[PDB]
Design a protein around this ligand. Structure first.
Ligand SMILES: CC(C)=CCC/C(C)=C/CC/C(C)=C/CC/C(C)=C/CC/C(C)=C\CC/C(C)=C/CC/C(C)=C/CC/C(C)=C\CC/C(C)=C/CC1=C(C)C(=O)c2ccccc2C1=O
Ligand code: SF4
Ligand code: SF4
Ligand code: SF4
Ligand code: SF4
Ligand code: FES
Lengths: 187, 183, 124, 219, 407, 166
C-alpha cells in the first residue's frame, strides 16, 4: 500500500499510490468542481471543469485525471486564483448554450450544474449571442428521455454504458458544437 | 328551554327567526386573545374599524357572559386544556371562530408544540385564514357567522337539521380522496 | 345482548377502517358488535345522550370537532358515560389523549390488531 | 486539544444528507468544524478582558477552568470547563475590571455528532460599566448532561436554565427547582434536541397531503 | 397561617394577562403575598420549527415570535445571518436606514399597544382606542411598505425584501408630522391624569439592583435611571449616525416605565425624522448576487408579482440569473458554520439572538433571548406585597408580549 | 392649574364633535394598500395561456407548506402554458398560508401574484383548500380557452419576453 504524500492547497495528506488529485481533494474536504469525473468510471477529463494548478506545471491540470505523484503541490480554486479563473471560465462556457430550463427541468434542485454554477460561476450571463438548440425531448428508449440542449456532453452516460455495462447503444455523435448523445437511428 | 318546545308551526319559525336575529346582533366575544391574531382582534375593536357596530363592543371578560369565542391565536398543547375549559364554561348557545391559520389548522407552525387546529378541542363554527387576518377579514368572518346564526333551527327543527346534516356528512368523500387532475 | 360501538369520524375511510379492525364479533368469546356511525359532533353527542353504548371510538382528527374534544365533552356531560377510545393523528397528540381522559388511544393509521386489542381491553 | 469541534461531517457534495440524487458525487468528506481557539492577540478589549481574567484566576486555575478561547466575527467565546463554571462566573461578575453584571440568559444547543460534548450551554454576559460583552460556553456529554447552575451568581438564569433543561435535558445541578417551564410537566422528551422528532402532521389537500418538513428531502 | 390566604389564578384567560400568561397569586385577602408565574401557554415550537427551513425563510418564523416587535425580531435574525456571513459591512446604506426607520416606527407601535393594553387593564378604556388610532396610523405605513399589517417578512438577510413604494416616504413624512399631535392627544388622557398617576406612581417598584439581578432590560431597567440602551452602547445597523436621547427615569416604578415609553415614542419620531433626512436612493440588497434575494417584486394590473423585467431576465436571457434565482429561492444561501450572539434594543429590552450555523442552508440553531421572558422574572418582585390591582399595573408596566416569552 | 390632569376630558369631548374615523366595511370597505398580500392569483398571458409552468418553486419557498403543485406535460392536443411543463394541479391551503409572499418572490414566470382581494372564510376545513380553478384569474377579453396552441409563430421565449398579444 505504497503511500504518496502531497500538499493540496496549503495542507498535506498521504494517499495510496495512483490516487487521483480529485479523490485526494475529496478526502481532505475540498470540493473541486466536476462534471465528467466519476469515481467508478475510468477518468476522461472531458469537461475540464476540475482544473487545478499543480506546481511545476504551466497549464492547469484536470484534477480528475492527474494521478498523484510524491511531493506534488496543488492549489485549488480555494487558493489558486489561476485555477479559480480556469474553473469559472469553463463554467461560463458550460452555461452559454444551456437552456433556461431550470423551472421545467426535472433535475432542478438536484442539479450538479446548478449547484456548481452557484459555487463556481459568474453572477450573471456574459453571453448575448444565440444559444445552441436541439429539438427536445427525444426518447432513446421507452424509459429514458433525452434533452440534448441540457447535455453538458460529459460522456458519463456513454462511459457508463460502455465500461460499467456492456451496452454501448448510445454514443457521442456528430462533431464539434453539434456533438450529442444519441442512439443509433431508432434502435 | 321552553322556547324550543313550541309546535313546529308558525310560532316556532318566527321564534327561530327573532332569536337568530337577536343572537347575531348581540354576539359578544370572550376576552380570549392568544397571539398575533389577538392584536389584530383588538385592532378590529379599535376606532379605524368598529366591531361595536355589530353589537360586539362588549368583549366579555367572564366566559359566562360570552356567547362567541374568537380563538385568535395559536393553541399550544399546554393551552388546549385551558381553551377547552373556557369554552365549556361559556353558557350555550355558543359559537367558536377559529381566527387565523394557527387557530384554524395550526398554520405555519406544524410542530409538536401546536395543536394544529382548535377543531381538535372545540367545535369550530367558522374558519378564518390570514396570518394575521386583517380586521376586515375578521369582520367578514363574523358576518358569515351572523348568517349562520340567523339560519339556525330550534326544537324539533333543530333535531331534523341535525339528522339531515349527519346524513349528508356521512357521504362526502374525504379530502385525501378528492383526486382531481392529480394524475 | 349486542354491544353498540359509536365510531365517530367525518372521514368515511377511517370509519370503514375501524369497522374492519372490529368484526361483527371481535374475540369470539365476546358478544356481537353493533356499529352506529356518526360524522358530526352534534350527532355523536346526541347518540351518546341516548346512551346504551359499550364503547365510543372518536377520531381525534375529526375536522369540524376533534374526537378528543368530543371525548372530554362526553365525559363531562353524560352520567355513566361509556369508555372512550381515541384515534390520534399524531404521536405528540398522546398528551392531549391523556387529557381527553379516554381509556385508551390508538395512533393513526389504525392498526387493526392494536385497535381490536384496545377495544377488547375496554369492553372487558 | 486545539483541534476544532466537529459538530457534523458532511458526506458528498451539495449537502446531501444521504446517498444523493446523482451518482459519483458522494465521496467528499467535509467535517463541519466550529472555529478553533484564537491564537492569542484577541481583538479589541477581548485581550484586556481575558488577560484580566487570567490575572484574577491563577495560572493553574485559569488553565483548568478555561478550555478554549474563540474569537469569531468580533465576538468572544470562552469555552469554559464544566464544574468550574460557577467560579469563573463569580470572578467575572465580581471583579471590578470585568464586572459583567448582566447575564442575559442561557441557551442550549445540541450537537449529537460532537463526541462527549453533545450539549452546549451558552451564557451571554454583558458588563454595563465597561460596555463589554462575551459568551461563556459549557459543554456537557449526553450521558452526563449535568452542568453547575449559576443561580447563586446570576439569578436571571433560573428561568433560562429551566427552559434549557425542558428543551434539552441539560440538568443544572444545584438549581432550586428544574421544573419544565414551557412544556407540560408530564411531557416526554426534550423537544429542542435533534433526536426529538419535529412532531408535525401532514398538510391536507384535495386528493393529497404534504408530510412535515422533517420527513421530506433536504440539503 | 393557612386559612387566611387564598390561592388564585390570574390565569391564562384574564383580561390583564394577554390570554396566555398565568399569574398564580397567594393573596392575604387582597394583598399579593407570592406571585408564581406560569409560562408556556403560548409555546409554539418556533425555535425548533426554524431548523427545518432555510435562511430568509426562518424570517417568517421569527417575526411571529414577538409579534408586537416584528421588525425588531426580523432585524435581529437578519443581523445574525449577516454577522455569520460576514456581510454586515456590505449591506447598502439605504437598507440600514430603512431598517432604523422601520424599527423605530415599530417601537412607536409596540409602545402604543403596551400603553393601550395597560390603560384598558387599569380601566382607562379610551386609552385602548386612542393608542390604536395612533397605531393604525403606523400600520397603514407598514401595510404599504410590506403588504402586511403584522408579522412582516420585510427585513431579510443582507437587506430588505423590497424597496419602499414611491408613496412610502410621503406616508412616513405624514407620520412624522401627525404622531406628535396624536400622541399628545393620548398623553392628555394619562400623562398627568390624577387617577392614572395614582394608579402607577410608586407601583411595581424595582431597584436597579433588582433589575441587574433578574437581567431586566428595556423601560424597566431605564426607569431606574440607568441610561442603558443597546442602540447607544453596542450600536447596530447604523444607529451610530443618529442623534437621539436615551430616555431614562428615576421613579423605578410603573409610572416611570410608562413615562419612559411615552418619551421613547418621541425619540422614535425624532429618529424617524433623521432617517427620512438621510434616505438617499440606492439598492436595498447586497450587490453580491451569490447571496442577494433574487426576487424583484413589482405591482401590475394583475397584482403584486415578480417584476416582468426580472421574468424576462431569468427566463429569456440570463442562465446564471436563472440558476441563482432558482437556488437562492429554493435551497437558499448556505451560511458558513459558526456561532454568533447578536442583540438589539427591542422596545421591551435587550432582544438577543443566538444563531448557530452548520454550513447548511437551514439554520442549525436560532435561540431568542426575548426580553419579555426575562422581564417576567420581575412579576414576583413587582407584585409581591402590593395590592392585586397594583399587581395588574405592574404586569402591564412590564409590557410582556407572550409570543416572545413562549416562542 | 390642576387643569392638566383634566386634559383627558378635553380630549374625549373634542372627539365627540369630530367625525368618526371608522372605515365603513363592508358597505364601504377601506382602501387596502396596493402592495397588500391578498389572495394568491394564477394569471394568464394575453392569448389566454396559463402563465404557471408547474415548476413548484412557489410551493418550494412556502415556509408553511401551503402550496401543492403537480406539473404535467403540455402537448399539441392539450396545451395550458407555453413550454413543456404546466401546473396541472395547483392547490393552496389557505388554512396554512401565512400570506408571507415568499411564493410570489419564488415564482419565475409571474404566474403567481397577490391580489388585494382579502375576503375569505368558510365553515369547512376543506372549503379553504383553494384549487387551480378557483385561483385562475378571470379570462379577460381577447383571451381564448386555456387548452390551445401557442400564438401563431410565437414561442415560449416570445412569451417570457412579453412579446405576445391577443
Ligand atoms: C301596543 C303597545 C304600544 C304595546 C307596548 C307593549 C310593550 C312594548 C311593553 C313595554 C313594557 C314591557 C317591556 C313589558 C314586558 C314584560 C317585561 C318587562 C319583561 C322583562 C323580561 C326580561 C327580564 C328580559 C328580557 C329583555 C328585556 C326587554 C328586558 C328589559 C330591558 C333591558 C334593556 C334589560 C337588560 C339589558 C341590559 C340593560 C343589559 C345587557 C348587558 C349589557 C352589558 C349591555 C350592553 C353593554 C353595556 C351596558 C356596557 O356597559 C358596555 C360597555 C362597553 C362596551 C359595550 C357594552 C355593552 O355591550
Ligand atoms: S446525457 Fe450523457 S453526456 Fe450528456 S450530460 Fe448526461 S451523462 Fe453527460
Ligand atoms: S395565525 Fe399568524 S398572525 Fe395569527 S397568531 Fe398565528 S402566527 Fe400570529
Ligand atoms: S405559480 Fe409560479 S412558481 Fe408556482 S408552479 Fe406556477 S410558475 Fe412555478
Ligand atoms: S403567501 Fe406565503 S404561506 Fe401563503 S402560499 Fe404564498 S408563500 Fe405560502
Ligand atoms: S471532472 Fe475533470 S475534466 Fe471533467
Amino acid at each position: 500500500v505504497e503511500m504518496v504524500s502531497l500538499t493540496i492547497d496549503d495542507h498535506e495528506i498521504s494517499v495510496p499510490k495512483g490516487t487521483l488529485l480529485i479523490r485526494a481533494a475529496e478526502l481532505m474536504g475540498i470540493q473541486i468542481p466536476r462534471f465528467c469525473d466519476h469515481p467508478l468510471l475510468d477518468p476522461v477529463g472531458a469537461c475540464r471543469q476540475c482544473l487545478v494548478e499543480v506546481e511545476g506545471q504551466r497549464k492547469p491540470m484536470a484534477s480528475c485525471t492527474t494521478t498523484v505523484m510524491p511531493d506534488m503541490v496543488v492549489r485549488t480554486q480555494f487558493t489558486s486564483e489561476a485555477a479559480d479563473k480556469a474553473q469559472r471560465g469553463v463554467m461560463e462556457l458550460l452555461l452559454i448554450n444551456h437552456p433556461l430550463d431550470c423551472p421545467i427541468c426535472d433535475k432542478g434542485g438536484e442539479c450538479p450544474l446548478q449547484n456548481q454554477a452557484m459555487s463556481n460561476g459568474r453572477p450573471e450571463t456574459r453571453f448575448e449571442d444565440v444559444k445552441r438548440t436541439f429539438p427536445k425531448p427525444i426518447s432513446i428508449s421507452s424509459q429514458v428521455l433525452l434533452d440534448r440542449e441540457r447535455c453538458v456532453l460529459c460522456a458519463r452516460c456513454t462511459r457508463f454504458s460502455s465500461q460499467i455495462a456492456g451496452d454501448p447503444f448510445i454514443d457521442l455523435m456528430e462533431r464539434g458544437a453539434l456533438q450529442q448523445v444519441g442512439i443509433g437511428q431508432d434502435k | 328551554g321552553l322556547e324550543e318546545r313550541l309546535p313546529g308551526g308558525i310560532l316556532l319559525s318566527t321564534v327561530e327567526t327573532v332569536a337568530g336575529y337577536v343572537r347575531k346582533g348581540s354576539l359578544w366575544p370572550a376576552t380570549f386573545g392568544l397571539a398575533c391574531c389577538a392584536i389584530e382582534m383588538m385592532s378590529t375593536a379599535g376606532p379605524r374599524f368598529d366591531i361595536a357596530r355589530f353589537g360586539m363592543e362588549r368583549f366579555s371578560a367572564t366566559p359566562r357572559q360570552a356567547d362567541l369565542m374568537i380563538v385568535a391565536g395559536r393553541v399550544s398543547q399546554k393551552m388546549a386544556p385551558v381553551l377547552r375549559q373556557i369554552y365549556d364554561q361559556m353558557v350555550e348557545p355558543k359559537w367558536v371562530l377559529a381566527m387565523g391559520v394557527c387557530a384554524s389548522s395550526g398554520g405555519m407552525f406544524n410542530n409538536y408544540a401546536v395543536v394544529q387546529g382548535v377543531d381538535h378541542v372545540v367545535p369550530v363554527d367558522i374558519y378564518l385564514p390570514g396570518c394575521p387576518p386583517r380586521p376586515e377579514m375578521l369582520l367578514h368572518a363574523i358576518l358569515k357567522l351572523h348568517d349562520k346564526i340567523q339560519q339556525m333551527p330550534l326544537g324539533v327543527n333543530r333535531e331534523e337539521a341535525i339528522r339531515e346534516a349527519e346524513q349528508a356528512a356521512l357521504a362526502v368523500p374525504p379530502t385525501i380522496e378528492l383526486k382531481g387532475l392529480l394524475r | 345482548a349486542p354491544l353498540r360501538i359509536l365510531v365517530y369520524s367525518d372521514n368515511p375511510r377511517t370509519r370503514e377502517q375501524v369497522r374492519l379492525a372490529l368484526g361483527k364479533r371481535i374475540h369470539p368469546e365476546l358478544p356481537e358488535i353493533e356499529y352506529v356511525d356518526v360524522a358530526t359532533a352534534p350527532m355523536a353527542i346526541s347518540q351518546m345522550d341516548a346512551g346504551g353504548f359499550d364503547l365510543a371510538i372518536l377520531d381525534g382528527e375529526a375536522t369540524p370537532a376533534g374526537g378528543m374534544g368530543v371525548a372530554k365533552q362526553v365525559k363531562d356531560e353524560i352520567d355513566d358515560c361509556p369508555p372512550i377510545l381515541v384515534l390520534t393523528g399524531r404521536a405528540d397528540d398522546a398528551w392531549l389523549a391523556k387529557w381527553s381522559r379516554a381509556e385508551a388511544a390508538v395512533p393513526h393509521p389504525i392498526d387493526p390488531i392494536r385497535l381490536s386489542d384496545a377495544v377488547v381491553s375496554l369492553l372487558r | 486539544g486545539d483541534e476544532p469541534e466537529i459538530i457534523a461531517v458532511r458526506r458528498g457534495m451539495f449537502g446531501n444528507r444521504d446517498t444523493g440524487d446523482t451518482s459519483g458525487y458522494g465521496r467528499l468528506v467535509r467535517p463541519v468544524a466550529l472555529p478553533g481557539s484564537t491564537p492569542r492577540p484577541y481583538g479589541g478589549y477581548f485581550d484586556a478582558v481575558m488577560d484580566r481574567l487570567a490575572e484574577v484566576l491563577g495560572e493553574e486555575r485559569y488553565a483548568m477552568s478555561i478550555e478554549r478561547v474563540v474569537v469569531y466575527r468580533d465576538q468572544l467565546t470562552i469555552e469554559v470547563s464544566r464544574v468550574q463554571l460557577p467560579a469563573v462566573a463569580s470572578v467575572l461578575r465580581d471583579d471590578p475590571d470585568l464586572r459583567f453584571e448582566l447575564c442575559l440568559g442561557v441557551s442550549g444547543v445540541h450537537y449529537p455528532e460532537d463526541t462527549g460534548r453533545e450539549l452546549h450551554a451558552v451564557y451571554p454576559l454583558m458588563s454595563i460599566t465597561h460596555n463589554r460583552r462575551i459568551q461563556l460556553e459549557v459543554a456537557a456529554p449526553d450521558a452526563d448532561p449535568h452542568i453547575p447552575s449559576l443561580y447563586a451568581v446570576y439569578p436571571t438564569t433560573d428561568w433560562h436554565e429551566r427552559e434549557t433543561y425542558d428543551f434539552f435535558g441539560i440538568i443544572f445541578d444545584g438549581h432550586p427547582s428544574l421544573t419544565r417551564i414551557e412544556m407540560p410537566d408530564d411531557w416526554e422528551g426534550h423537544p429542542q434536541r435533534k433526536d426529538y422528532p419535529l412532531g408535525g402532521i401532514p398538510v391536507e389537500y384535495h386528493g393529497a397531503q404534504i408530510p412535515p418538513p422533517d420527513q421530506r428531502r433536504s440539503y | 397561617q393557612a386559612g387566611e390566604r387564598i390561592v388564585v389564578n390570574m390565569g391564562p384567560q384574564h383580561p390583564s394577562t394577554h390570554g396566555v400568561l398565568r399569574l398564580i397569586l397567594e393573596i392575604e385577602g387582597e394583598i399579593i403575598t407570592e406571585a408564581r408565574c406560569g409560562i408556556g401557554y403560548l409555546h409554539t415550537g418556533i425555535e425548533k420549527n426554524l431548523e427545518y427551513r432555510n435562511w430568509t425563510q426562518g424570517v417568517t418564523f421569527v417575526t411571529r415570535m414577538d409579534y408586537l416587535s416584528p421588525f425588531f425580531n426580523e432585524t435581529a435574525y437578519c443581523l445574525g445571518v449577516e454577522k455569520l456571513l460576514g456581510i454586515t459591512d456590505d449591506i447598502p446604506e439605504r437598507a440600514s436606514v430603512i431598517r432604523v426607520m422601520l424599527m423605530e416606527l415599530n417601537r412607536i407601535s409596540s409602545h402604543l399597544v403596551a400603553l393601550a393594553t395597560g390603560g384598558m387593564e387599569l380601566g382607562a378604556m379610551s386609552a385602548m382606542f386612542y393608542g390604536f388610532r395612533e397605531r393604525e396610523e403606523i400600520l397603514r405605513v407598514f401595510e404599504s411598505i410590506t403588504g402586511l399589517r403584522m408579522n412582516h417578512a420585510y427585513i431579510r438577510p443582507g437587506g430588505l425584501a423590497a424597496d419602499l413604494p414611491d408613496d412610502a416616504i410621503t406616508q412616513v413624512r405624514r407620520l412624522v408630522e401627525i404622531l406628535p399631535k396624536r400622541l399628545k392627544d393620548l398623553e392628555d388622557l394619562l400623562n398627568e391624569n390624577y387617577i392614572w398617576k395614582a394608579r402607577t406612581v410608586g407601583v411595581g417598584y424595582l431597584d436597579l439592583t433588582g433589575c441587574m439581578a433578574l437581567g431586566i432590560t428595556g423601560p424597566i431597567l431605564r426607569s431606574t435611571g440607568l441610561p442603558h440602551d443597546l442602540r447607544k452602547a453596542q450600536p447596530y445597523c447604523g444607529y451610530e449616525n443618529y442623534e437621539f436621547d436615551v430616555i431614562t427615569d428615576d421613579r423605578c416604578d410603573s409610572y416611570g416605565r410608562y413615562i419612559i415609553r411615552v418619551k421613547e415614542m418621541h425619540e422614535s419620531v425624532k429618529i424617524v425624522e433623521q432617517c427620512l433626512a438621510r434616505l438617499k436612493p440606492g439598492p436595498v440588497m447586497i450587490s453580491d448576487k451569490k447571496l442577494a434575494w433574487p426576487a424583484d417584486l413589482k405591482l401590475g394590473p394583475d397584482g403584486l408579482g415578480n417584476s416582468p423585467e426580472h421574468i424576462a431576465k431569468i427566463m429569456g436571457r440570463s442562465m446564471e440569473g436563472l440558476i441563482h434565482h432558482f437556488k437562492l429561492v429554493t435551497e437558499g444561501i448556505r451560511v458558513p458554520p459558526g456561532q454568533v450572539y447578536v442583540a438589539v434594543e427591542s422596545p421591551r429590552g435587550e432582544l438577543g439572538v443566538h444563531m448557530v450555523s452548520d454550513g447548511g442552508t437551514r439554520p442549525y440553531r436560532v435561540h431568542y433571548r426575548d426580553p419579555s421572558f426575562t422581564n417576567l422574572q420581575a412579576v414576583a418582585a413587582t407584585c409581591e406585597g402590593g395590592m392585586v390591582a397594583d399587581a395588574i399595573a405592574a404586569v402591564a408596566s412590564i409590557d410582556p408580549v407572550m409570543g416572545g416569552v413562549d416562542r | 392649574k390642576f387643569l392638566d390632569a383634566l386634559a383627558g376630558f378635553a380630549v374625549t369631548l373634542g372627539s365627540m364633535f369630530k367625525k368618526p374615523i371608522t372605515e365603513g366595511y363592508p358597505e364601504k370597505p377601506g382602501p387596502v394598500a396596493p402592495r397588500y398580500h391578498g389572495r394568491h392569483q394564477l394569471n394568464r398571458y394575453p392569448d389566454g395561456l396559463e402563465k404557471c409552468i408547474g415548476c413548484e418553486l412557489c410551493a418550494w419557498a412556502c415556509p408553511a407548506d401551503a402550496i401543492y403543485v403537480e406539473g404535467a406535460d403540455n402537448t399539441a392536443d392539450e396545451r395550458y402554458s407555453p413550454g413543456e411543463r404546466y401546473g396541472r394541479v395547483y392547490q393552496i391551503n389557505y388554512l396554512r398560508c401565512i400570506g408571507c409572499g415568499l411564493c410570489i418572490e419564488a415564482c419565475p414566470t409571474r404566474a403567481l401574484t397577490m391580489t388585494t382581494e382579502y375576503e375569505m372564510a368558510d365553515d369547512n376545513r376543506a372549503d379553504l383548500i383553494w384549487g387551480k380553478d378557483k385561483l385562475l384569474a378571470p379570462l379577460q377579453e381577447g383571451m381564448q380557452a386555456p387548452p390551445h396552441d401557442m400564438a401563431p409563430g410565437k414561442t415560449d421565449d416570445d412569451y417570457y419576453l412579453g412579446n405576445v398579444t391577443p
